[PDB]
């Protein structure tokens, strides 16, 4: 019954044990171990649930414990204290094996290679708490222990790969609690949460590991977005240390999403385009990822429009995400037609939805874009029309009103016209040719540089598998 479940689970865990321990004891294999860990972890959290929830505890029982028995005993007891051979060090099935922690060696404290394993065991635990939503006290306790525990280590490269994943849950559980409900407790721990990440990021530069570094920059840029401190995000960007050397595709993808947000609130749109497109491309196109793509697609509307290019009607039409991007389709149509009344109506009705995604603050600014388009339309159609007629059409207040919109539009050059107040009409000064400008030179430069970029990327990549098959014996 209960005894059965423990042995069956523990065996499954031993298999996984073997694979990872061989790597670290045969010197770091760097990229390779990160790949192995994720796949094992997906399998393992799912396992944890069935055949008792003491699956994690079994593994701790048949291995040495520098500090792992203490944590496992705290967790168990909380979730109703239970005795079934579940007090670590109870059952013995190591039997003098270096692998499964030699009997003799431990007493003396001759072997102390548990550390990395400890990171991984905690790592499963953080994730199981999250799936359950029994985060709460259990999660806070793990977090407590684990901060002095990393500072007790003088870390190695393999262990940094694992702690880059611990760090993901540590940020998040604080967010989870704060996001339930504002608590006086939540405030105190935010300031704490910021400090510790900062501090650890300085150490992780020196040890020289990409994963710990990239991950920490990402968590901290997201911390900045919630608190409205754009300035602290800017100085942070300006640090410059964000590497590209071995960083996962998960970390880059999140990286670019944040960049898009940070530039747009401080009134730069140019550079936000490149990243909002990049961020869709690095992210994969699965259903479990669909949510992230819904976030990107909402942002893509604001960013694009403020720069002064209309994003595809098509892109939002022919998605499955069309219902999420239903209020947003209605933003795009309002701008297109130039109708003020339409845009105002949209943002009133859907206001509650828009606030969650944090697109709403960007929408106050998108008001400005609606108006310029309405007068842009009139200028293309009509070369000479009296500003009297322009007032009627877009339902503006006076003759002074109509002048001051059009006057600003031409400073930025968007309408490109000339106002005549003593000949009583606006006359378009549109040249509207770019084939007898030095402009095409400037476009073609980007296209050519991108193309060569790819020719090199084919060349470099091509060789590495060829080399490996050559090492292996074949005819």
């Amino acid at each position: 019954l209960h005894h059965s479940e423990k042995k069956y689970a523990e065996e499954d865990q031993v298999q996984e044990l073997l694979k990872v321990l061989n790597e670290i004891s045969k010197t770091t294999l760097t990229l390779d171990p990160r790949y192995i860990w994720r796949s094992l972890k997906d399998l393992s959290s799912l396992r944890n649930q069935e055949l008792l929830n003491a699956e994690t505890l079994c593994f701790t029982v048949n291995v040495l414990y520098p500090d792992s028995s203490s944590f496992k005993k705290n967790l168990l007891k909380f979730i109703t204290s239970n005795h079934k051979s579940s007090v670590p060090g109870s059952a013995e099935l190591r039997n003098s094996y270096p692998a499964s922690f030699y009997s003799v060696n431990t007493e003396k404290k001759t072997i102390e290679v548990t550390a990395e394993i400890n990171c991984f065991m905690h790592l499963l635990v953080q994730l199981f708490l999250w799936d359950s939503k029994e985060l709460e006290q259990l999660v806070e306790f793990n977090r407590k222990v684990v901060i002095p525990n990393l500072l007790c280590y003088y870390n190695l490269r393999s262990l940094n790969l694992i702690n880059a994943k611990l760090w993901f849950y540590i940020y998040l559980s604080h967010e989870t609690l704060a996001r339930s409900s504002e608590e006086i407790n939540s405030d105190n721990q935010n300031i704490i949460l910021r400090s510790t990440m900062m501090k650890f990021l300085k150490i992780a530069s020196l040890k020289h590991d990409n994963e710990t570094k990239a991950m920490l920059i990402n968590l901290i840029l997201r911390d900045f977005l919630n608190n409205g401190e754009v300035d602290s995000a800017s100085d942070f960007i300006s640090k410059l240390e964000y590497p590209h050397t071995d960083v996962s595709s998960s970390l880059e993808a999140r990286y670019f999403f944040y960049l898009s947000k940070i530039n747009a609130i401080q009134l730069d749109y140019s550079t936000a385009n490149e990243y909002i497109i990049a961020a869709i491309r690095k992210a994969p196109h699965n259903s479990k990822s669909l949510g992230f793509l819904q976030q990107s697609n909402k942002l893509h509307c604001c960013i694009q429009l403020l720069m002064g290019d209309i994003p595809e009607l098509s892109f939002f039409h022919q998605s499955n995400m069309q219902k999420s991007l239903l209020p947003y389709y209605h933003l795009t149509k309002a701008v297109k037609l130039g109708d003020l009344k339409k845009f105002t109506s949209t943002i009133t009705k859907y206001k509650q939805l828009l606030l969650k995604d944090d697109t709403y603050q960007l929408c106050v600014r998108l008001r400005s874009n609606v108006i310029k388009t309405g007068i842009r339309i009139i200028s293309l159609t009509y070369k000479k029309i009296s500003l009297r007629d322009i007032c009627l059409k877009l339902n503006l207040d006076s003759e002074q009103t109509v002048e001051y919109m059009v006057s600003r539009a031409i400073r930025d050059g968007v309408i490109e016209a000339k106002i005549n107040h003593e000949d009583g009409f606006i006359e378009t000064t549109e040249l509207l040719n770019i084939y007898d400008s030095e402009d095409p030179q400037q476009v073609f430069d980007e296209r050519i540089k991108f193309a060569n970029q790819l020719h090199d990327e084919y060349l470099v990549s091509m060789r590495y598998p060829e080399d490996k098959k050559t090492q292996q014996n074949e005819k």
Binding site: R447, I448, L459, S461, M462, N473, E474
Partner: protein
Amino acid sequence: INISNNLQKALTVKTNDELMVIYISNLVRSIIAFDDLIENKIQNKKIQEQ
């Protein structure tokens, strides 16, 4: 310069196409290496024996 870009885009297909063909050669070389690995399993028993 337009023609240089359009001509260069042709060359972007050429270079990329070849990439797939090498990974085909790598694919074949692992089956061949497997047959070798089987022959070499047998060879090791001879070594012990003799």
